[PDB]
Amino acid sequence: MIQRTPKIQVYSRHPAENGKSNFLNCYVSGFHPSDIEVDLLKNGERIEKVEHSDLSFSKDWSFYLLYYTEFTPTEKDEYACRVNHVTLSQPKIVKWDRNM
């Protein structure tokens, strides 16, 4: 058996073909086993509509998830990624740095 804690990155991107749109991304990387729970949060509340959830693996024991959706941030709103995994005794919450 092998288990690996995910690395978690939270960041925003504008698609270059449509630069006015903005996407909030979580990249949850290098984890094993593949069982996982991942949410985007807005002011502590789970975002129910997340448009994209893309899972892949490299080696048979390394999984990668890109979880992202369109959003319109304002400076009053706080966003975060919340991940649960067997390697994490408590849910891990990674705040979005608004300059990233």
Author numbering: 0 to 99
Please give me the paper's original passages concerning this structure:
Beta-2 microglobulin (β2m) is a 99-residue protein, physiologically acting as the light chain of the major histocompatibility complex (MHC) class I. β2m displays a classic immunoglobulin fold, and is well conserved among vertebrates. β2m tertiary structure consists of a seven-stranded beta-sandwich; according to standard nomenclature, β-strands are named from A to G, and loops are named after the neighbouring β-strands. The characterization of β2m structure and folding dynamics gained considerable resonance when the protein was found to be responsible for Dialysis Related Amyloidosis (DRA). The mutant protein is the etiological agent of a previously unknown systemic amyloidosis, whereby patients carrying the D76N mutation accumulate large mutant β2m amyloid deposits, especially in internal organs.
Conversely, D96 and D98 fall in a negatively charged region, clustering with E74 and E77. Notably, the D98N variant 3D-structure is among ones at the highest resolution for a monomeric β2m mutant. Although D98N is the highest resolution structure (1.24 Å) here presented, the electron density in the area surrounding the mutation is not of excellent quality as elsewhere in the 3D structure. None of the variants showed a marked Tm variation (relative to wt β2m), however some features are worth noting. Although such ΔTm is relatively small, the consistency of the two values (for two mutants that concern nearby residues) adds significance and indicates that removal of a negative charge from the C-terminal region slightly stabilises the β2m fold. Even if the D98N structure is well superimposable with that of wt β2m, the D98N mutant displays local increased flexibility in the C-terminus and the neighbouring EF-loop; such flexibility is somewhat unexpectedly mirrored by a slightly increased fold stability (ΔTm + 1.3°C). Differences of roughly 1 or more standard deviations with respect to the wt structure can be observed only in the in the DE-loop of the D53N mutant, and in the EF-loop of D59N and D98N.
